[PDB]
Design a protein around this ligand. Structure first.
Ligand SMILES: [Zn+2]
Ligand SMILES: [Zn+2]
Ligand SMILES: [Zn+2]
Ligand SMILES: [Zn+2]
Ligand SMILES: [Zn+2]
Ligand SMILES: [Zn+2]
Ligand SMILES: [Zn+2]
Ligand SMILES: [Zn+2]
Ligand SMILES: [Zn+2]
Length: 354
């Protein structure tokens, strides 16, 4: 099941992970020209578009009819901005093909040659699918954690395949993730562009240095019993999650130790067994989480033996509702069920007491 799809996912994430790692400092330096404020006031950069371009072009070259829910859109981008996207893709190709080329794998072809500005626009815009309850589609956040990217910190490149509303396959590139920062040992080859994490439903979760992506090491959550010894994972950005209510949960459960970082790299650390509980409570209850912020993590966490629900009702997340999740917030943990249920019911109670 889904062998070709996993190869495509992995290689697409891999090449985009190299590009985003390499361009990060330049994007930061040239923020006035490389960064755009979208209509929700969130940032998008040359790197986000370049990653979306590489990944969707790779999907379409290998699966021409496939549907994609991608975060970004080319509408309104100027030709100059698009030429910059294309140039970064070709600069990356020159490094990538020297060093990391995968035999018998195509990123582009006759139909999708990725040569012109119009090609770039077209490819970005294949991410305009609405998702939903039936059928197969890909789900992409080309740079998850753009704010973290722009702070020179953690971010992730995130791709998933959903079939009939269920995430079947996930692949997360964490180009800046150094495991020695999180207690753990790094693997040979990590230094160039971080790690890739991946999973297929029913087949396990694995990781590899991005530069490798051939030798895969199986991962599983850890199981601490002394909750007081547990570590939470939370976002850094104050406006992405209710950090004060999250702290309330922590106080109440005596879970003092804290890691903060942007992106679905958090799910990767949970799945690797370096932390225990991920908390993302909504500040505003009208907010609907985007599926691309959670899909890849969902299957990776599942396959690593963890639990993934909303933050109030303790129900599994439903990836067949369209581009958004209908529930409120997200909580993931190592389990077991009783611990997970405690965390979620504490979250519910904190939110109800507002
Ligand atoms: Zn450049
Ligand atoms: Zn449609
Ligand atoms: Zn993004
Ligand atoms: Zn995101
Ligand atoms: Zn964004
Ligand atoms: Zn090293
Ligand atoms: Zn915190
Ligand atoms: Zn287990
Ligand atoms: Zn439960």
């Amino acid at each position: 099941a889904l062998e070709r799809e996993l190869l495509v996912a992995t290689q697409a994430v891999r090449k985009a992970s190299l590009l985003t790692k390499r361009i990060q400092s330049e994007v930061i330096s040239h923020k006035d020209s490389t960064t755009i404020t979208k209509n929700d006031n969130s940032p998008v950069t040359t790197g986000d578009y370049a990653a979306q371009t590489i990944i969707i072009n790779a999907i379409k070259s290998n699966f021409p009819d496939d549907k994609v829910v991608g975060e970004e859109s080319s509408s309104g981008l100027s030709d100059a901005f698009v030429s910059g996207i294309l140039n970064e893709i070709k600069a990356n190709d020159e490094v990538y093909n020297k060093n990391y080329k995968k035999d018998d794998f195509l990123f582009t072809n006759d139909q999708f040659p990725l040569k012109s500005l119009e090609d770039v626009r077209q490819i970005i815009d294949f991410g305009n699918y609405e998702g939903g309850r039936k059928g197969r589609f890909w789900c992409l956040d080309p740079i998850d954690g753009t704010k973290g990217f722009l702070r020179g910190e953690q971010f992730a490149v995130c791709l998933a395949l959903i079939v009939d509303g269920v995430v079947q396959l996930g692949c997360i590139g964490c180009p800046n993730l150094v495991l020695s920062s999180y207690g753990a040992q790094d693997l040979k080859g990590h230094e160039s562009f971080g790690y890739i994490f991946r999973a297929v439903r029913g087949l396990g979760a694995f990781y590899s240095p991005s530069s490798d992506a051939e030798s895969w090491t199986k991962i599983h959550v850890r199981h601490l019993k002394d909750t007081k010894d547990m570590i939470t994972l939370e976002g850094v950005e104050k406006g992405h999650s209710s950090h004060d209510e999250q702290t309330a949960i922590k106080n109440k459960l005596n879970i003092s130790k804290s890691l903060h970082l942007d992106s679905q790299a958090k799910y990767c650390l949970l799945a690797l067994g370096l932390a225990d509980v991920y908390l993302r409570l909504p500040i505003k209850l009208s907010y609907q989480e985007k599926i691309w912020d959670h899909a890849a993590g969902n299957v990776i966490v599942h396959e690593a033996g963890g639990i993934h629900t909303d933050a109030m009702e303790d129900v599994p997340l439903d990836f067949g509702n369209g581009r958004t999740l209908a529930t409120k917030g997200v909580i993931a943990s190592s389990g077991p069920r009783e611990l997970h249920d405690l965390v979620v019911s504490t979250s519910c109670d904190v939110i109800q007491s507002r």
